[PDB]
Design a protein around this nucleic acid. Structure first.
Ligand code: ANP
Ligand code: ANP
Ligand code: ANP
Ligand code: ANP
Ligand code: ZN
Ligand code: ZN
Ligand code: ZN
Ligand code: ZN
Ligand code: ZN
Ligand code: ZN
Lengths: 703, 703
DNA sequence: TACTGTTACGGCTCCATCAGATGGAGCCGTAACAGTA
DNA sequence: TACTGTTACGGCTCCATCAGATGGAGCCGTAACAGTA
């Protein structure tokens, strides 16, 4: 009936004991960095998978990507668990829609088994010892599934090495097929593998459902066609029927990629299994979230238990049990602050999330909107990607929001066209802009700063000090001391990523890692330098009473007071304090940062640049993996930036960020190739007065 | 609440629909070959594992040993499943107790991580780049887990190639360590890996629980020592504390190996998982079975569902739901004959198992036992393995049974000493006997025939015709026809395992197998010869109106009438008919035979030999994987053999076979090194009069 | 003249894609040889 | 003289044991260069 966890002390959890009911919709809320992912994904999922993969093959456990055993006492009432984590990276030039969903492997098998080969020179059928066409004197090699893939030299096109593009233009030889001519002659139903991939998902499902095959080949392909049709049906049902299997995964949007990842791991139809979803609503519109909620309720109805760590209001309003962590974040949180039904969380004074839900704390909506001051910049002939020749004028000096469902072209319109043109005109960047006619009004701005929506990169060689750039100033200050000057030290001596002034027992890592072979690797503290990352010679040089280790092991609040007379350092630390990271250390490794904290570090990297008084701030979904309090702080700083006399445009699905905006531009009216038209454009009240778009309906519902 | 299976047509199932309750003890009874394994292991376990391993890593699914998708419509209420199958082979000279339970991998990791190397020439500690002792000028190689294993050239002893024995004697170099001298110098707590392996399990558990390690090494070994202790505790609790991790798996008994396999896959402590056990009581005494029943009830109490296909009366008397298949076997069965509680099966007239349980059918107990006729053969100084110098006289001309718990030395006493000495004296075999003084009374016998307890070998090149040896006579008869004589045909032309007279499109297999890569292979019928295994020239030669394909595609009952004037063929087919295989074809492949049918084929191979009127019949657990009806038939034929004037000794844990015996010899009083003494020796009533042995208690309880 | 932005180069880390090899035992078929009746 | 048992040799099949490699993107540190105030 219950999952009992006792003595959970993983990461920042303060030895908490929590009972999670089974066969229920249980959400884990709280601030960013409070211990939701560490409670669910790092502990419960890890134990549930570890206790089941041991009752399987011994050799195959190594390739499963095993998880380290959590620092817990005992877990009762556990069950096998499948989880979809909150960490997405993507951006691979060798991964497509076919390989991500694994349908391409099935297609390779199907073409290798029951395909019909030919000679690519005359088209006559090839028959056999040697599998060659006797007319053109060409010897085709053996037919195997590894010859229909572009990630090995056997089946990859020689010119582009299976990349597709070789000035970025399609490959002259394969024309984007990525496979050699020999492997493109095997046809099923009149099409080779590339042509079948180029077909839309909806078209391909019916192409495979209407295939005429001999009695011999149907026996072989019965176990392949059924799986292919099941996967295509999952993709269609999730709401992505307009995609093609040949699209690169480096071009998919956030919502499309998230839905692709969701549809793969959900359709198994099991029973008595715990499903763990970590932030399942990133880059998803309100209608996409409602569809996902319906699907998840259907999945629970089979007899499963759901543990979803969600920040959105809609998810918490459709659940039977809420577990709230906190009361703060980082080292200041990690306890079970409140529990129970959403009404109990609303009535619980100690729960910050309940305070926001109840209305005790809220994001202030301005009484009067900021009307445009007569300055507009206009774009005409927007035809990039799936934009159907629309023209929109973006105001200046006000807070602008760009809305619309996933695939409507919000990124393609704002990011590509606007940012690339502005950066080429003002920052003198060497970037190819999108397909458009012209932009009028560039002479009304001075600089452009953008925040992309891709997640940041993780590495043990980077911390907030290096990412924000303040570490360079700190190292210069340390190298400017009299003792460092008389010892010959430079700024490169004080960095743990440069050899010469770092602990050589760990190469500046600070902790040695012992390599197991079939078990997760272990991390143990260093012994030579005690984990200070530096030798004794470096640590002797002190500035204002602290050496570099002591200045790298101090929180942001402490470094704010420590660095007061230095303008650049104070400005950067003040921005870091403003975005919300007033409790994390100045040298915590990136790999140990939560998603929200990494996102806030990325925001503070760009929000700390000097403003010229008339600048362009382009933000692509800034409120991803952020609690309502972080959203409130971000809205406050953005509104202060606007009041300073600057123009800010924000592409957000968050309703609270939208409801405070000054001018809303809506793209739609549907996702994919069916959208690209400006549904509405005006003040939030005017857009709420329009019933053609779901965004207007939600805006008028909340107002 | 229920597992609903509809349209199950795998193997010989006749499209049955069955609902199996969840969180219950459900047994699947029926005859041998009726469709229990095909219903449970091949369908439910296959679907349950297939529907879960897809929600895991893609690469690691290949190494998991995937199961083919069953020929079923839809299964509802499924859940992830772990199963222990009924097919055990063992007999590997490169597998020990350590590797089977995987504790040896953990020990290799532990020794590679926190070991203490030395030089094997002087004993001084080795320190370093190269790990070498500067005194003896010896350079020890790198320390890795792959250097502590004898299955790779890095860590295997050169002399014996890691076999241990190089006239079978221990290796002169390693003295049975199987590892080279360099890898035997790494010691933990004063012992190398071989010494720790040689320690008993109970001793080693306390050796690891009382190890003094530095604070540095405890951090590394915390995740290893806990797992090692857990596995050792499982082995101790199952009832096998006397074993040592260095014992070869080719010497373990049936009960010990079965308990080792049971203890590994049960201790996971999950919930909402279906456990499938296929014949879990092979080679296990009554007390071992009672312990296993207690453990299984404890495992179900956690909230699991158990599907155990069992023939034993004890298992069916401790269950809440019985599913009975039949009503016959082979092509004559496959339907759900009866279902419900054990009382309902007792009162169900159509259930053969219920008929046997109720007492309508029973094994007749003779009114008066056959007293010995004054002829005895005596063995003195029995000290083989764990026999403590005991002497027993085995009577002649009566049915003798050897009882006792697993490890008591029943096999070591009867099989090794008696069979090897009798075969060396009478059959002129070149076999080394066991350790004993002498045997008096060999001149009272003429021949010895034995039936070992090891399972038979499976291959697609063998069928009952070839295994029983009747196929050679059939081929000779076919080659003796006038047309074959005039065509130059020989007996080697008529065998599908010899090239020249077989379908070259399949090399006599009869079905081509298409090789997938990450999916289970598919089997499709041949096209050139239509699966007749022979070409047109061979099939033209006909004997008595049938060619060789028609005589290879006929059941045993039909071939009994077809071959009536040939003495040898009729005798062999009559024996095959008597043992119970009157419905299977004469050419069904071995890989498709059930366990019980393969066992009966093995029995009929040896029971068909000519008896001299005074012969020795040694049977080692003949009633393994056989229903009560097959047991009744085997008891009948054995009693007829005894009445013919021969002596039969049977080493069986089956109580029905024991209760009909004429003279019982009991070994005990406990398993392992604590046994080897003759607890009781006399008629069944006399043994029942003794309360020192559990066998006597059971005998007096049933009588 | 210093601040701020860009671009290029080398080293380190992480994520996505890819779809088994080897050794020995058991069985079939065939030939050779001995005991027995 | 024929039946029955054992033993040796070559080919085919199955089970147990064993514990990742490669390619490209993102980040850090450093140098060079241009616009601006
Ligand atoms: N390996 C680690 N070592 C030390 N601290 C860690 C580690 N991993 C995470 N933390 C910290 O533990 C706290 C909780 O992190 P985590 O539980 O992953 O975040 P979360 O609550 O899911 N928040 P978010 O992902 O931003 O919504 C944060 O302060 C992290 O910086
Ligand atoms: N290079 C490309 N080639 C073809 N189609 C593309 C390409 N890049 C993007 N698309 C498609 O163009 C449509 C709009 O993409 P994009 O503008 O990035 O989405 P978006 O509106 O920002 N959605 P989201 O970020 O999820 O809220 C989607 O259907 C994309 O799959
Ligand atoms: N692959 C197969 N093709 C055809 N027939 C098969 C196949 N596998 C099994 N059978 C037959 O199907 C019947 C049931 O076999 P199976 O279900 O494995 O046995 P079982 O009921 O568990 N009996 P047993 O193992 O002896 O206790 C038998 O007649 C088998 O010979
Ligand atoms: N070669 C060997 N070296 C050491 N111990 C051995 C060896 N062979 C067997 N044993 C042990 O000797 C004991 C008796 O073995 P064995 O006589 O085969 O058992 P059994 O009584 O027939 N039991 P079971 O067949 O399971 O009913 C067991 O503890 C075996 O592990
Ligand atoms: Zn040609
Ligand atoms: Zn190309
Ligand atoms: Zn160090
Ligand atoms: Zn030495
Ligand atoms: Zn050796
Ligand atoms: Zn054929």
């Amino acid at each position: 009936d219950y999952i009992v966890v006792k003595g959970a002390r993983e990461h920042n959890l303060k030895n908490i004991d929590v009972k999670i009911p089974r066969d229920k919709f249980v959400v884990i809320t709280g601030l960013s960095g409070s211990g939701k992912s560490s409670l669910a994904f790092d502990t419960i999922y890890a134990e549930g998978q570890r206790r089941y993969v041991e009752s399987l093959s011994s050799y195959a456990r190594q390739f499963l990507g095993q998880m380290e055993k959590p620092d817990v006492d005992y877990i009762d009432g556990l069950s096998p668990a499948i989880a979809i984590d909150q960490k997405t990276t993507s951006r691979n030039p060798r991964s497509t829609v076919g390989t991500v969903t694994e349908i391409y492997d099935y297609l390779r098998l199907l073409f290798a088994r029951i395909g019909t080969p030919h000679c690519y020179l005359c088209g006559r059928e090839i028959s056999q010892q040697n599998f060659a066409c006797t007319e053109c004197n060409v010897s085709m090699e053996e037919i195997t599934p590894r010859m229909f893939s572009f990630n090995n030299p056997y089946g990859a096109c020689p010119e582009c090495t299976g990349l597709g593009s070789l000035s970025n233009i399609p490959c002259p030889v394969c024309k984007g097929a990525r496979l050699k001519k020999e492997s493109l002659a095997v046809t099923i139903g009149g099409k080779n593998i590339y042509e079948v991939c180029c077909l839309s998902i909806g078209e391909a499902k019916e192409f495979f459902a209407n295939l005429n095959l001999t009695e011999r080949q149907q026996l072989i392909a019965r176990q392949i066609l059924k799986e292919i049709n099941a996967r295509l049906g999952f993709l269609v049902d999730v709401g992505l029927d307009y995609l093609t299997l040949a699209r690169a995964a480096g071009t998919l949007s956030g919502g499309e990629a998230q839905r692709i990842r969701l549809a793969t791991q959900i359709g198994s139809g099991l029973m008595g299994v715990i499903y763990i979803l970590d932030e399942p609503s990133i880059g998803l519109h309100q209608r996409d979230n409602d569809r996902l909620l319906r699907s998840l309720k259907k999945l629970r109805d089979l007899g499963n238990t759901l543990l979803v760590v969600e920040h959105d209001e809609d998810t918490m309003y459709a659940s039977d049990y809420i577990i709230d962590l906190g009361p703060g974040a980082g080292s200041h949180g990690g306890q079970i602050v409140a529990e129970g039904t959403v009404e109990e969380i609303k009535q619980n004074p100690n729960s910050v999330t309940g305070e926001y839900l109840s209305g005790r704390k809220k994001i202030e909506v301005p009484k009067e909107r900021r009307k445009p001051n007569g300055k507009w910049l206009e774009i005409i002939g927007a035809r990039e990607n799936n934009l159907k020749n629309i023209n929109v004028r973006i105001p200046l000096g006000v807070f602008t929001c760009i809305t619309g469902v996933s695939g409507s072209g919000k990124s393609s319109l704002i990011n590509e066209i606007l940012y690339k043109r502005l950066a080429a005109e003002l920052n003198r960047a060497s970037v190819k802009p999108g397909e458009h006619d012209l932009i009028k009004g560039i002479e009304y701005l001075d600089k452009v700063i953008d925040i992309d929506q891709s997640p940041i990169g993780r590495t043990p060689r980077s911390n907030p000090a290096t990412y924000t750039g303040v570490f360079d100033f700190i190292r210069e200050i340390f190298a400017n001391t009299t003792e460092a000057k008389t010892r010959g030290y430079k700024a490169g001596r004080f960095s743990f990523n440069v050899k010469g002034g770092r602990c050589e027992a760990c190469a500046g890592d600070g902790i040695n890692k012992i390599e197991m072979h079939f078990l997760p690797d272990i991390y143990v503290p260093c012994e030579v330098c005690k984990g200070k990352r530096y030798n004794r010679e470096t640590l002797e040089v002190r500035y204002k009473g602290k050496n570099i280790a002591e200045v790298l092991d101090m929180t942001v609040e402490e470094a704010l007071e420590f660095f007061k007379n230095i303008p650049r350092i104070h400005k950067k630390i003040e921005t870091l304090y403003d975005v919300g990271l007033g409790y994390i250390k100045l040298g915590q490794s990136s790999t140990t940062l939560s998603g929200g904290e990494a996102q806030r570090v990325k925001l503070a990297t760009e929000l700390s640049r000097k403003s010229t008084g008339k600048t362009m701030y382009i933000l692509d979904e800034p409120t991803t993996g952020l609690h309502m309090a972080d959203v409130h702080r971000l809205v406050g700083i953005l509104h202060r930036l606007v009041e300073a006399g600057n123009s800010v445009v924000v592409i957000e699905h968050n309703l609270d960020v939208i409801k405070t905006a000054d001018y809303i531009i809506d793209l739609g009216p549907e996702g994919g190739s069916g959208g690209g038209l400006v549904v509405a454009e005006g003040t939030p009240e005017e857009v709420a007065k329009v019933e053609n778009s779901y965004t207007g309906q939600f805006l008028k519902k909340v107002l």
